[PDB]
mmCIF file of C-alpha atoms in Angstrom:
data_model
loop_
_atom_site.group_PDB
_atom_site.id
_atom_site.type_symbol
_atom_site.label_atom_id
_atom_site.label_comp_id
_atom_site.label_asym_id
_atom_site.label_seq_id
_atom_site.Cartn_x
_atom_site.Cartn_y
_atom_site.Cartn_z
ATOM 1 C CA UNK A 1 0.000 0.000 0.000
ATOM 2 C CA UNK A 2 0.927 3.722 -0.149
ATOM 3 C CA UNK A 3 3.850 4.913 1.973
ATOM 4 C CA UNK A 4 4.165 8.604 1.164
ATOM 5 C CA UNK A 5 4.548 10.483 -2.114
ATOM 6 C CA UNK A 6 6.364 9.644 -5.392
ATOM 7 C CA UNK A 7 9.512 11.639 -6.153
ATOM 8 C CA UNK A 8 12.735 9.772 -6.919
ATOM 9 C CA UNK A 9 12.542 6.622 -9.020
ATOM 10 C CA UNK A 10 11.385 5.983 -12.575
ATOM 11 C CA UNK A 11 10.649 8.859 -14.950
ATOM 12 C CA UNK A 12 7.421 8.640 -16.927
ATOM 13 C CA UNK A 13 5.092 10.812 -19.068
ATOM 14 C CA UNK A 14 3.395 12.262 -15.985
ATOM 15 C CA UNK A 15 6.690 12.804 -14.142
ATOM 16 C CA UNK A 16 8.503 14.826 -16.805
ATOM 17 C CA UNK A 17 6.176 17.815 -16.461
ATOM 18 C CA UNK A 18 6.101 17.291 -12.690
ATOM 19 C CA UNK A 19 9.868 17.599 -12.341
ATOM 20 C CA UNK A 20 9.824 20.402 -14.875
ATOM 21 C CA UNK A 21 6.938 22.206 -13.203
ATOM 22 C CA UNK A 22 8.381 21.491 -9.750
ATOM 23 C CA UNK A 23 10.916 24.277 -10.189
ATOM 24 C CA UNK A 24 13.977 22.214 -9.295
ATOM 25 C CA UNK A 25 16.821 20.619 -11.319
ATOM 26 C CA UNK A 26 15.973 17.267 -12.895
ATOM 27 C CA UNK A 27 18.447 14.439 -12.426
ATOM 28 C CA UNK A 28 18.005 12.083 -15.370
ATOM 29 C CA UNK A 29 19.696 8.694 -15.222
ATOM 30 C CA UNK A 30 19.714 6.838 -18.519
ATOM 31 C CA UNK A 31 20.867 3.247 -18.492
ATOM 32 C CA UNK A 32 20.829 0.590 -21.173
ATOM 33 C CA UNK A 33 21.178 -1.930 -18.343
ATOM 34 C CA UNK A 34 17.742 -2.712 -16.913
ATOM 35 C CA UNK A 35 19.179 -5.655 -14.968
ATOM 36 C CA UNK A 36 21.887 -4.066 -12.819
ATOM 37 C CA UNK A 37 19.873 -0.837 -12.460
ATOM 38 C CA UNK A 38 20.364 -1.345 -8.717
ATOM 39 C CA UNK A 39 24.101 -0.683 -9.071
ATOM 40 C CA UNK A 40 23.814 2.705 -10.764
ATOM 41 C CA UNK A 41 20.651 3.717 -8.924
ATOM 42 C CA UNK A 42 22.378 2.672 -5.698
ATOM 43 C CA UNK A 43 25.320 5.033 -6.009
ATOM 44 C CA UNK A 44 22.540 7.371 -7.067
ATOM 45 C CA UNK A 45 20.587 6.549 -3.918
ATOM 46 C CA UNK A 46 22.848 8.965 -1.998
ATOM 47 C CA UNK A 47 23.507 11.208 -5.000
ATOM 48 C CA UNK A 48 19.855 12.106 -4.537
ATOM 49 C CA UNK A 49 19.454 11.493 -0.813
ATOM 50 C CA UNK A 50 21.501 14.676 -0.518
ATOM 51 C CA UNK A 51 19.471 16.422 -3.165
ATOM 52 C CA UNK A 52 16.124 14.750 -2.572
ATOM 53 C CA UNK A 53 14.404 18.090 -2.102
ATOM 54 C CA UNK A 54 16.568 20.029 -4.554
ATOM 55 C CA UNK A 55 16.911 17.716 -7.566
ATOM 56 C CA UNK A 56 14.424 15.308 -9.166
ATOM 57 C CA UNK A 57 16.229 11.984 -9.464
ATOM 58 C CA UNK A 58 14.624 9.940 -12.213
ATOM 59 C CA UNK A 59 15.976 6.856 -13.963
ATOM 60 C CA UNK A 60 15.473 6.267 -17.676
ATOM 61 C CA UNK A 61 16.383 3.765 -20.393
ATOM 62 C CA UNK A 62 19.482 4.657 -22.411
ATOM 63 C CA UNK A 63 18.527 1.894 -24.861
ATOM 64 C CA UNK A 64 15.009 2.986 -25.822
ATOM 65 C CA UNK A 65 14.943 6.502 -24.429
ATOM 66 C CA UNK A 66 18.667 7.158 -24.914
ATOM 67 C CA UNK A 67 17.733 9.573 -27.698
ATOM 68 C CA UNK A 68 16.511 11.729 -24.812
ATOM 69 C CA UNK A 69 19.860 11.412 -23.004
ATOM 70 C CA UNK A 70 21.695 13.697 -25.375
ATOM 71 C CA UNK A 71 18.689 15.705 -26.525
ATOM 72 C CA UNK A 72 20.031 18.055 -23.853
ATOM 73 C CA UNK A 73 23.740 17.450 -24.455
ATOM 74 C CA UNK A 74 24.991 13.860 -24.770
ATOM 75 C CA UNK A 75 25.236 12.075 -28.107
ATOM 76 C CA UNK A 76 23.732 8.786 -26.928
ATOM 77 C CA UNK A 77 27.003 7.102 -27.907
ATOM 78 C CA UNK A 78 27.330 5.144 -24.659
ATOM 79 C CA UNK A 79 25.411 4.281 -21.507
ATOM 80 C CA UNK A 80 24.264 4.224 -18.868
ATOM 81 C CA UNK A 81 24.241 8.003 -18.997
ATOM 82 C CA UNK A 82 23.273 10.790 -16.595
ATOM 83 C CA UNK A 83 21.699 14.160 -17.349
ATOM 84 C CA UNK A 84 21.119 17.190 -15.136
ATOM 85 C CA UNK A 85 18.364 19.346 -16.620
ATOM 86 C CA UNK A 86 17.885 22.710 -14.916
ATOM 87 C CA UNK A 87 14.277 23.885 -14.826
ATOM 88 C CA UNK A 88 15.478 27.279 -13.595
ATOM 89 C CA UNK A 89 17.988 28.227 -16.288
ATOM 90 C CA UNK A 90 17.108 25.503 -18.817
ATOM 91 C CA UNK A 91 20.605 24.081 -18.555
ATOM 92 C CA UNK A 92 21.795 20.526 -18.925
ATOM 93 C CA UNK A 93 24.823 19.384 -16.936
ATOM 94 C CA UNK A 94 24.968 15.615 -17.738
ATOM 95 C CA UNK A 95 27.767 13.123 -17.062
ATOM 96 C CA UNK A 96 30.382 11.517 -19.322
ATOM 97 C CA UNK A 97 29.874 8.200 -21.121
ATOM 98 C CA UNK A 98 33.510 7.102 -21.083
ATOM 99 C CA UNK A 99 34.709 8.021 -17.606
ATOM 100 C CA UNK A 100 32.901 6.027 -14.897
ATOM 101 C CA UNK A 101 29.378 6.223 -13.501
ATOM 102 C CA UNK A 102 29.641 5.533 -9.785
ATOM 103 C CA UNK A 103 28.418 7.334 -6.699
ATOM 104 C CA UNK A 104 31.306 9.471 -5.539
ATOM 105 C CA UNK A 105 31.708 10.318 -9.220
ATOM 106 C CA UNK A 106 28.098 11.372 -9.761
ATOM 107 C CA UNK A 107 27.363 12.574 -6.257
ATOM 108 C CA UNK A 108 30.519 14.676 -6.417
ATOM 109 C CA UNK A 109 29.943 15.726 -10.022
ATOM 110 C CA UNK A 110 26.358 16.881 -9.499
ATOM 111 C CA UNK A 111 27.654 18.416 -6.270
ATOM 112 C CA UNK A 112 30.116 20.461 -8.301
ATOM 113 C CA UNK A 113 27.181 21.300 -10.564
ATOM 114 C CA UNK A 114 24.737 22.539 -7.955
ATOM 115 C CA UNK A 115 27.521 24.283 -6.054
ATOM 116 C CA UNK A 116 28.298 26.253 -9.192
ATOM 117 C CA UNK A 117 31.346 24.504 -10.532
ATOM 118 C CA UNK A 118 29.926 22.764 -13.597
ATOM 119 C CA UNK A 119 28.722 24.688 -16.622
ATOM 120 C CA UNK A 120 27.309 24.235 -20.168
ATOM 121 C CA UNK A 121 29.333 21.998 -22.485
ATOM 122 C CA UNK A 122 27.582 22.321 -25.850
ATOM 123 C CA UNK A 123 24.464 24.364 -25.067
ATOM 124 C CA UNK A 124 24.286 28.093 -25.849
ATOM 125 C CA UNK A 125 23.714 28.911 -29.518
ATOM 126 C CA UNK A 126 22.617 32.486 -30.357
ATOM 127 C CA UNK A 127 21.406 33.656 -33.763
ATOM 128 C CA UNK A 128 23.393 36.768 -34.822
ATOM 129 C CA UNK A 129 22.509 38.934 -37.830
ATOM 130 C CA UNK A 130 19.540 41.311 -38.004
ATOM 131 C CA UNK A 131 18.162 39.221 -35.156
ATOM 132 C CA UNK A 132 19.430 39.211 -31.569
ATOM 133 C CA UNK A 133 21.777 41.865 -30.218
#
């Protein structure tokens, strides 16, 4: 039976707008591995337990949804992947797909993100000419 309210877990069609309308950074966690999900999501357990009320931790499939992993930055070249969509600035501070997706690595990374250490990697593309400026 019920045991509270849904927040961190699996991202769906009714959760996207909820994490986007919530007004807090969205922590996407793509993963082509739907078997060992516990491993990634575990290290993530704390990565969000620290930011449970500041970031929306939601897991996603990097095999079927992967296209959504880099729709904010990544290239969907490898997985699992991790994205950090900001619903305040509309930023996307995801993780690498050739480094190592652990806890200390994500928890620390995101930590360096929220703190104000991480910044856009590919985003930011203005349209000069008669327009803008």
